[PDB]
Design a protein around this ligand. Sequence first.
Ligand SMILES: CC(C)(O)[C@H]1N(c2ncnc3[nH]ccc23)CCC1(C)C
Length: 167
Amino acid sequence: VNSFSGYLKLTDNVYIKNADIVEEAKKVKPTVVVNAANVYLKHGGGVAGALNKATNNAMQVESDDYIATNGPLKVGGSCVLSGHNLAKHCLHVVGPNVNKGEDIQLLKSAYENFNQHEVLLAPLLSAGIFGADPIHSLRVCVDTVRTNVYLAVFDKNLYDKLVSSFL
Ligand SMILES: CC(C)(O)[C@H]1N(c2ncnc3[nH]ccc23)CCC1(C)C
C-alpha cells in the first residue's frame, strides 16, 4: 500500500491520472519523481522547467554541477539526483526529442531506467514539447516498465484520450 490516490489502473503495475506532476509531488513526496530531462539538464520548460521552478532553481544549480563534473547524459539515459522539496530523489530521464530529430526507438531505452526503482511518479516521456505521440509513449511505458509507475498527465483532454484509447 502506498499514498498515491485517484489513479486509474491500466495494468498490473501502471497507473494513470490527470494531474500536475508538480502538485502531485508536493503532496505525496514520493521516493522517486521522474523529470523529463535533456542531456544538458537544462530545465527550461515543459515538465523540467516546472519541476525546477518548484525547487526555487535548486534543481538547476545541482544539475549544473552534475554536468560540469560528468558531462551530458545520453539520449535514453538517466541520472539520480536530489528530489529537493518534491521527493527523496529525482530520476532525470532523457527521452528522445522529436523536435531535434532524435530516434524514437530510444524511448524504450529511456523507460528501461524506471525498472531500477520499485515505485515512481512520472510524466509520459517524450510527450509535450519533446514532440512524440503521448499515446505511443504510454504504450511503450506499459510494455517496458515492470516496476510500479504512477503517471501524471497534465492535459485533461489528453488524459481522457489516453484512457479511452488504451488497449
Ligand atoms: C509533456 C507531458 C506528457 O509530460 C505533459 N506535461 C506535464 N505533465 C505532467 N505534469 C506536468 N507539470 C507541468 C507540466 C506537466 C506538460 C504537457 C503534457 C503534454 C500534458
